[PDB]
Structure formats: C-alpha cells, structure tokens
Amino acid sequence: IESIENLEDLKGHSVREWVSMAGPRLEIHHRFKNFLRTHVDSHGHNVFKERISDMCKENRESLVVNYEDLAAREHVLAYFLPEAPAELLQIFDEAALEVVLAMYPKYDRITNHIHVRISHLPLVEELRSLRQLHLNQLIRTSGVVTSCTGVLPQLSMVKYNCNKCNFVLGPFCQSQNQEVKPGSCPECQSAGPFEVNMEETIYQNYQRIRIQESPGKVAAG
Amino acid sequence: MKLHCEVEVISRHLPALGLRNRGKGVRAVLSLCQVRAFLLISTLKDKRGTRYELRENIEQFFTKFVDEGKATVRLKEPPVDICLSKAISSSLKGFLSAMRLAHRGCNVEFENFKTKMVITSKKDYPLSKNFPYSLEHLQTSYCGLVRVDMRMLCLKSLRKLDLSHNHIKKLPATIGDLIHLQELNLNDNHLESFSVALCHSTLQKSLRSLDLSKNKIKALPVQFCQLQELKNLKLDDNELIQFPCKIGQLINLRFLSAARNKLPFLPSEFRNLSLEYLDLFGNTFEQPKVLPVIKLQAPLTLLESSARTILHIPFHLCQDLDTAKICVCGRFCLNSFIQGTTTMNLHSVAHTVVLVDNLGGTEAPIISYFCSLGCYVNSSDM
Amino acid sequence: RNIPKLDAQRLISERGLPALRHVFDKAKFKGKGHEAEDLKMLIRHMEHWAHRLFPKLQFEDFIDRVEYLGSKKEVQTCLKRIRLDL
Amino acid sequence: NCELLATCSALGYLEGDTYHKEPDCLESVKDLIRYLRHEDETRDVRQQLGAAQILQSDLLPILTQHHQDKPLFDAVIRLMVNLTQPALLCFGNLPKEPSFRHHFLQVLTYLQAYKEAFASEKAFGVLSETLYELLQLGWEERQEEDNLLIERILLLVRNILHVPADLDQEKKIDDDASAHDQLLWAIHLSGLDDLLLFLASSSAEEQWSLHVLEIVSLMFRDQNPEQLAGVGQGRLAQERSADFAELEVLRQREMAEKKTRALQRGNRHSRFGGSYIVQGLKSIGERDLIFHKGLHNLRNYSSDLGKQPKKVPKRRQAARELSIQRRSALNVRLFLRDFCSEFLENCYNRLMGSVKDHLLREKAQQHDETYYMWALAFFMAFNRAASFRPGLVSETLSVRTFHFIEQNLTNYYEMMLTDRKEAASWARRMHLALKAYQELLATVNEMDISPDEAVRESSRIIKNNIFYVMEYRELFLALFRKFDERCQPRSFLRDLVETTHLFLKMLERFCRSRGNLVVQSEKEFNFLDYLKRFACSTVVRAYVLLLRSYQQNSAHTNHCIVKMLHRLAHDLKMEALLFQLSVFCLFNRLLSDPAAGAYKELVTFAKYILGKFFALAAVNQKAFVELLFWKNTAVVREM
Amino acid sequence: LGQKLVIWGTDVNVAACKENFQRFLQRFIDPLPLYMQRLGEINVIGEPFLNVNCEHIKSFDKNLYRQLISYPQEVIPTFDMAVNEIFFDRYPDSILEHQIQVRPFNALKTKNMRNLNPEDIDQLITISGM
DNA sequence: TTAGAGAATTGGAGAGTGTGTTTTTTTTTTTTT
DNA sequence: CACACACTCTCCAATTCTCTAA
Ligand SMILES: [Zn+2]
C-alpha cells in the first residue's frame, strides 16, 4: 500500500467509504501513530509519552486525546473525525494500541484494546437542538444524568452451541441495533434452539444512562 | 460434472442483522460451466439459473457430514453461503473437487414424479406397466382383482398400498418383499385369511398400519404377533371369532377397531396392551360367570412349558412360547394349562373406549389363569 | 375437483349457443333513432348469458376468449347447424 | 482494488479549480488502460473506476487543463473512450440472469454519472478546439496519428450522447433541462455543432459521414419534427397559456368523473344494509338473483361489479411504448431548430449521398441503414414543416429510396417473424422503415400542392412508378395480416393506419383523376378490387384495436380509423364483417361517453352500423349468434 | 330493471313503494303540497336532507308506513330515490353537493331501551334518551 | 390459408410448515392543612 | 398444550408454441 500524500481529495467519495477503504485507512493509521509519537506541548514536553505512561502505570485501558491538539497538529484527521466517527475511532484505537505496545511491550497482559476518547470537541450542541443533520456524527452535549442502569454484561462477540451436534457457531458481532440470530449450523444446517457458549463468548460492560437538560438551562414552567 | 440436489443460498448478512433463513432446501441442479469458470444454480423458480463467480473467491468448505446424513457443504463466499441439503456422496465429492480446482483457477433437468397415484376403477385406467418404478404410494379401489398382481408387487419403494373395495379373495406371500411398506389396506375385500407366511417378511419390521375390515376372516394366524411395528389395526365388520393369543407382543399398537365381530372373550395377554383407542362395539361377548376351568394334573410337560417361558428355531419351543399360559399365570405358577375366564375393564388398556354394550357396558370377559387365589376369586365370582 | 374451462366442448354448445338462440326471443328493441338504448339492452342480455355460462370471467375477457374459440371444430359446426335448422 | 486505488492516486489531485498532475501520469494511465483491457467479463475494473469517479475527478481536469501535453492528452482520450464504451457493447446484450444484470446496471449507472459530469462547456470547448486545429490541415496532410484521433474524438462524443437517461432522474417535467438537454447546450456553446455541420458538408472529409450521422441521430433522439419546426420567438406566451388551459381541462374531467362515481354509489354508508331479489334475472342457478351492492347500482347493473380481472399471461401481455414524450428546454429546442435548418440547407444532400455510398460499398456496420431511414423521416418531415423546398432533399426523392426502404421493411418483417428472440427489436427497426416510407408518401403530396410544374412533373413520375410496382401496394396488406399487439406497440399501429390512409388517399385520387389501367407481364387494375383485399377480418380487427383508445388517439388518427371503416361499410357494403360483439362493446362505451359530443364522427358511424344491425336483427334473430365470432364469407350469408 | 325488484324475503315491490312515496310527497297537505314546500326550502337553503313525519306517512297510507317500519334498509333508499327524482324533475339546473336524504321520524318514542328485543332487529325505532 | 395434433412452459390448487394468544392496597412525600 | 392465520413449496394440468394436414 503506497503512502497517500493527500487524504483531503475525497475524489467524489463520502468520508465514510473513503476512510473505510484500505489506502486512506493505512494513511490515517500512520498519521495518528506519528501524531501520538511526536506531538509536543508549548514547553516542548512530549505530552502523550506522559499520558500513555500514566495510563500504563494505572492500568486504565483508555487514552484521552485533546481535539484541539489533534486539530492543531494533524488537520485532516480532525476533519474526518466528526464526519465518520465510528470508523476513525476504530482506526485510532488500533494505532494507539500499536504505540502503547511500543512503549510497554508486556501491556497485552493487562489489555487487548485501547479506547481513544476525544475531549474539547468544538461541536457543542444543546439537547433541545439535536436534529437529523447530526445523525452518525460526533456531537458534544451537556445535561444532568437522571437515570442509570446497573453495569450489565452485553454480548460483543458471541458464539453459539449447535442445538444437535457439538459444533460452535462463528463469532458474530453485536450491533446495539437488534438481537443477533445465529442462522443455521454450517456443519449440519440445523436452525433450532441455539444457546450461548458463555465460556467462549466475549462480553463487554454495558450501562444505559438517561440525561436531560440541566434545570437551570431549561425555561421556567 | 453437474450435480442434482436440494440447495439453500443464505446471504451472510442475515444472522448478524438478526434475520432468520428459511431452514430447508429447494430442489435444484448445480452446473460448473466455463472462458472463465461459473457456478450455475437452477431451481423450479428459475430454469435460467443464477451464476456465481468462483475464479478466486471461495471462502471455505464444510465437510463433516459429506456422508449425506443431515448433510451440507455450507460453501461460503463473498458474501453468500451455499448449502446442499441432500445429494449422493460420490458425485458430491467429485463436484467439490471440481469446485476446488476452479477456485485454484490456474487449471480449468430436475424432473420428478410424485409419491402418489390413484385408480378409482380399472375401467377408467388400468395399472398396466406404466407405473413409475420407485412409486411410494398407490390407491386401487372398486377393481376386480381376485389376487394382488406383480404390477404393484414389483414397485421398489412403496410406503402405502391400498386395495380397499377391490374383490381380493387371497393375497400373496411376495407382497412382503416391499421393504418400506408402512400402510396396507384391504377394506371391503373378500379375504378368507391374512397371509400366514407374510408375517415374517419385510412387513415384520416396517408395517405401521393394517386394515382388514369388511372381510370374512374368522381368525388371524397366531404368528400375526410378529407384526410388532404395527401401530394401527382395523378388523371390524369381520367374522373374527378370536384375536391371536400373542396379541400382547404388539407393543407399538395404539389404535384397535374390531367392532361387530364374533369375539366371545379377549385373550389373556390383552391386559398387556397400552392402546389410545379401542372399539369393540356389538361383538356379542359372553355374559355368564360360569367356571369351566381346565385342570392340569401337574405333568412334567406342562410344568416345563410353563417354567421355560420365564428363561427362554426350535418349533417345539416356539409352540411352548405360544402356549405359555401367560408364564403359567402371574402367581403361584404350576403349569401352563390352568385356564378360565374373568371380567376386565377396558380403561385398563385404552384411554378412549367405545362402550361395547349398553348398561354401563365398559367391560368384557377375558381369558384368565387360576392358580390358588385366582381360583378362589373365580369361585367367589361364580 | 373438475376445474372448469371456457373451452369448445364443456359448455359453449351445451349451455351456450343453444340458449343464446333463445335469449332474444322475447327482446324489446325499438329500431331506428334508438340505437343507444337498443345496444344497452343487447349488451345486458349478452352479458347475462355469458355470466350464467362461465361465471369466473368478466365480460370482455369472456369475449376475447370466445373469439379464439370461434376457430374450433365443434363451435363452427354448431354455428352452421344453427344457421341451417336446429 | 487497492492497486487501482494506488494508480488513481498517482494520477494527481485537484486544488480549488486547478489540477496538479504527477510526472508519472503517462505510465499510470497506460496501467489503467492495461487493467481495462485485462478486465473480467463482469467488467470489474469498469465498475471500480466508475465507483472511484476518476473520470470526473482526474481525467476531465487533465483533459481540460493539460491539453497541450499531447501524449497524455491522447492517452486520456483513449482511456475515456474505453470507459465511456456503452454497456450494451460491454456485455454484448441485456443479460438474462440476475448477476450479470446487476453488473450491467452498475456500468450503466456509472455511464449516467459520466454523462452528468460531461455537461461542462470546458470539456467540449477543448474537444472542439483540438478537432478544429486538426481539421484545419489538409486531408493529404493527415496520417494515422491524426485520423485515429478524429475517430477517438468523435467516438467519445458518440459515447457520451448515446447514454440512456437514468430511470431515477428521467422524471423531469417538460420545459426543464434534462441531462441530455444540458449536454446539447454544452455542444452548442462549445461550437462542436458547427464542426459537425462542416464535417457533414465537406466533400474531402466524407470518410466520417457515418460517424456524423450517428452523432446527429443521438442529438435529435428525443425530438419530433413538426413540433420542433413550430418553435419560434413568441412561444413562451403560447406555451404558458396552453399549460393553464390544459390544467383546467384535466381538472374538469376529474371533477366530472368524481361526480359520476358519487352518483353511482349512494348517499348512505357502505355498511347500511338491505337486499333485493331481481325476479326476472335468473342467477347462475335457477333461483332469482339476490342483489347486495345497494339499490344505486341496479340502475347500471352488470354482473362484473365485484369480479377480479384476470392476469394476462406473460406471452399475451401487450407491448407498451418505451418512453413518454417531454417538451425539452426552450433554449435547446431553439438551438436544435437552428441546427436542423442549417443542416438541411447546407449538409443534408451530401451526407445522405455519402451514407448511401457507404451502404452500397458495404463498409458500414450491421444496422446503419436504420440511421439512414431515421434521417430520412426526421429531416424530410422538418423540411415539409415550415418552408417546404424539395431541392433541400432532392437526393432522397428518387425511386431508389422507395425501393431501398421497401426492401428494408420487408427484410425486417421477415426477420421479425423468424428471429423470434429479438422480434421487438426487429419491430422497432421496421417502425423506423415505416416512418421513412410514410414521409416519402407525404412529401409527394406536398410536391403536388407546391406551385412548381417541374416538381409536379417528377411527382407524377414517381407516383406512376410506385403505384405501378406491386410491392408498394401489397406491403400494407402484408403488414396488417401479421401485425401482433403482443410484439408491436400501439404507436406502430397508429403509424401503419395513418400511412395506409394517406396511401389509399393518393391512390384513389390518382385513379379518379385518370385511368392508367395497366399494373405489375402487366395486368389490369382497379382501386375497388384493391380495396376488397382490406375486407379481411384481421385488418378490421387491428383497426378496432386502435379504435379502443379513441379517448387518447389524435383527432387525425380517429379520422383515419373512421374513414377507413366508413369506406368498408358504406362503399363496399361489408357491415356484417364489422357486426361484432367486442366492437359493439366499444360502441357501447362510445355512446355512453360523457364527451361523446367531441367524437361526432365516431358516434354517427357507430349509430349507422348499429341501425343496420338492428334492422337485420329484426328480420332475422340469428344475427345475435353471428355477433359472437369473427367471420370469412358469412359476411354474405348474413346478407 | 327497477320494476323487477322486491325486498329480500318481503314480497314488497320497490317500484310500487317508490310510486306510493312519490304520490305521498305530491298530495299530503294537512299537518294542521306540504313537502314540495320543504323541497323548495331545500332548493334555496342548500341542505341535502328532508325530514318527514312517519305519522303523516301512516295517515296517508298505512301499508306504506308498515313497509317503512319493517324494512327501512331498503325502503329508505327507495324514498331517497323518490325524493331526488321529484327534486330534479323540478328545479332542473339547481346544483347540490349530494343527493337528498329522506329522514323519517316519529314525533314521540315508539319503544324504550328496556323493551328492545331481537324481534326489533333491522327495524326502524324511535327512542328517548340522554 | 386455416386449424389441429404433439411438446414445452406457466398458473394456481392445495399440501405442508411455523407463529400467537386468556379498579385496589399500603406506603412514601410535599403541600395543605 | 391447540385452534386459527400466515407463508412457502411442490405438483398437476391447462394454455400456448411448434410442426403438419385439410
Ligand atoms: Zn450443527
């Protein structure tokens, strides 16, 4: 894959498919790795060396990136980030894992994924002002948390025992949209009462919160 | 090259998207055509079948059940998945080898006939020799067949053979050469008896429904009990004066109809039945509680025939099994000849009973054995 | 079951043309200057006859089928017979 | 996919409005051409480059901003011709199975996208400028280097004009600029239209006559000659007032139909019960009919009130017209009128002579005579429209063109009947031939009307020749006796009927004016025994089939139908041929029409034949049975 | 053809019922030509309905009243046809949004809610209530 | 030139499979009692 | 559980295509 000297020329694509295809994906990956490795603050201190070191000291599995720093240092990543946030956040997580395992080669024992979190995004929105124009875009809102579920286990990559034979169905990704139905067993074609393999299934923490407008920002009555 | 089989094509988005497939295949033919190789899948829906590219783009195969039991290939591709639910193993293996070669790439009518046919009368259509060879099901009715013919006997795959309302006087022994026969009906024919040697034929393991109603049979053979696969048995409107004494061996039996026959009393092993449905209406069972008991004299032969049934080809041993007298009565066994009769409630053996007679009429007499307390109870009843 | 057909032999010469000969014995046309209502009466009678013959079809579908049936042996033989005597 | 992405990236990038080409554009473009040449039969590289939109993003900017770099320009032109290759050429045919049809639709989608992109005037300006500075040189000065470039330029223009309109965006309303209209406007502003006129009029560059003919055909694809010839300065007020008036007419028709339906149903809700016995009407059994659909329906009772219509099986489904007509943009219509006028005055005779020479020499593709016949129809119709001058089309007025069109029409007729797997395509080719024949037959009438005794003389000569030779007379009967609604559209049936009406008009007037008895080894002739050949059941069956759409037919078409049927009835005494039950149902609709006053001729003819029928029926009741079938000589037995 | 119609299982001729209601409209005058005044009021006001008193129908023709009460689902549409035929035989170019509805009514209740029975099904009744 | 006998394709009857269902009381809390 | 709806598949035979004689 040749390095792409200009990510900015979409050449008629939209941002989502443009960053989904391999060339721009690798270019974004390398640009984010270089950003993490070489970004320095106003005093010349490498901020992300310190941040990754603190994260690995405390086993926290998550890396907060300042959007102001990203926009200042690497423009096109900040350009594509709010347009295709899921795709670029996946790529950023991969790149951050590469940098983290460069710094701490044994951190795979503690984690298998690094979550890149974005802070100080200028795209601030009021809850009353969210429209269909903001769909599938990275927004920033404010409010008071009024409800919280308990921390619940959710399927992320689920495996199913076949209802008759001993085969196990392949990894199916959970989507947040609907229940994943296994289909039919490829060994024998049965499609009966399948059951989750708890030991081979990968779970993730889930918590659904309800936020509302803060009572001092809502109008009286 | 071509393969005939049931096919099911599953687009692989469906499971993760939460959508469930049909769950069974559709009869089809697969063709490996080729300047560059294609797979053509054609069904009843499309003689002009769908192509699929396979030059470089087979994902993987599944082969755990290529022996063609609960089977498939589950051939995955970008993006579809192709399942082959029933074929023949050798041709399917050759087809899979050709598919693998085509994917390596560097080198190189679903006609059918139904299970079923019917003749409502010979003068409308005779059976002739135009039947399908592997026919599964046929009805013949109101035809003048005095005896069953090779025309239906030679059929290689019959599940159902029906001759009801024909004029059969006798039926053969070679009707039992039908391996998969599960339904045999001769309702309203002229049968004098069921075929004796037919009991130990393929029907011994295969027959699940037998109908001999409206025939002048006076008695079934004692080796009729060999038909232990049988679930449904219909014998009403006949001259039948007794069941076979070893009817208790018909452990698969669930439905029994023998209404308006000549039965005086039931066999002793009738207690071993576990029917769902029993019909014996108007059979003229005997009323009295008289005690005409057969006495033993305690001979060694009777004692041996009684006792050896509990520890059992030899024809004498088979006859002794038939004359076991229910293992020489259920208690205080002496010999297999101490025979009498008592009264039985038919809900002991069937959860649905047709009221055989009036005035309650839920009971009938049954052969019994009277060692000690049984004889005492019989004396009390008399 | 006996799924019916509007064919040349079931009904077209049995409940069809022989009855159509009799349908207009009691008709009530009034001639020149009244062609519109005469045609309305004619169409109603023809439609009623066609319905009682084959009730599965609409009237124009019945017409488009029977015009094809006009080429068949039984139909034209019955037509010539009706032209001649009975 | 990724290797194509790499080369597409290597082409360069756009910045604002300026394209910065990489130095390796030449080898990357050659690699793209190599991939396209080594395509799969599914045309995967075609689909992938269309998805990447490099034609819109790279090649058009390179073509428009680096046209001085001649090797790159030539390579880009060849690549663009390859990419704009029409889908029917890409796949050979319309695929019969879903996968190849999906690939066909993908390539067609990207072709439509290319056509959308190509409306920029800059691209056609560069193409016109390079073609102009090439054609500035003498023909003898050209070599393969320049002749092949002319071929590729004209093929690029042909490919871009050929593209079908997207089914999604063909819903444009009239008087709006479709993608084709914008493309024609781009050609107009670039001045490539004048270059096409030069190429058509040039004697030296006659080698490109077939190409230029195809360009002009695809340019005038959507237009109608008389409608186009009527365009002028004062059209905006006319069309505005016409639109308002037509809106009101449509509204009044809908209001009338709504009132009739409101009367047909009652003023009570549908679950308001009530049942009646109609004592006289026997049911399908012997019992009296029980009616449940309300008393209001028994005024116009029919037994098919509640019946589902029938599925016409696939084989019997009638052919439908392939496109609706829309009034294109007024600027484009004015430009096309001016193009057609100047082309007719300056180019048409030489171009048609050149194309006929090409067809004679047999250095043309398989069906280029279809373009020839199209050009005959369109430009002779445009000539007769507005200022008719036969000198502008005198190359076409020869009897040899009549012979050529008749031969082509008979050939297409035979091939339609035999090559059944593209019978509709052969029918369309035959339709083009029929329209060309119709325009010749109309042009001789216009020559008769015109004042010049010379053109009147030659009109008499060609009329004598055509009416003498037998095939011109027999072809109409041949077409009627094997026309099929299943295969040929109602537009074809309209054109056939109108051409037959015009032909019989001319022949009748000719024979009425003078005897001219010998015809076809000659034999005698008269028009009455010729008309008796139109007394067959099949031809009148076709005529009433066209009559069924009298509501939608043009007034001239209705006049043609009713005049032919009046000729067969009143003048040949063949009313029993037209005594039919289906025809009587059509007459019932005609008499029941609320707009029956607008069809005074049709209803009067219908009442004439109905009165004759009811006279015969009063005399003899077997006429009711005779209504039920089509007939042969029972037309005389009934009499 | 309307003259062949009879109400189902009723032996009442729809055409005869229509004619009887037409002569009722034409000739009843004495509530103290009555209903032609109501037709003119409809003509000038533009309201498509006609109120008619069942007692007037009864006093004019007992049999017509019995038919109306017993078989309203057919008789009331028959009265609609009658009144519209009269109204558009007169006033030939007046335009109405809908055909006129005849609205027969009894001045007082014929039955009460407690005494309604299955014998009264598909029968015209008048009841008082809140 | 019409139409009728044999072969192939399409319409739809029906056999088989899968899904969904049948005012009351005790306690708190803020405001008003 | 079990009795109605809802949906798919298969087979059967009725219609239309092709080739021949009246
Ligand atoms: Zn399995």
Side-chain angles (χ1 to χ4, degrees), chain A residues 162 165 185 188 190:
Chain A
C162 182
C165 67
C185 177
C188 62
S190 70

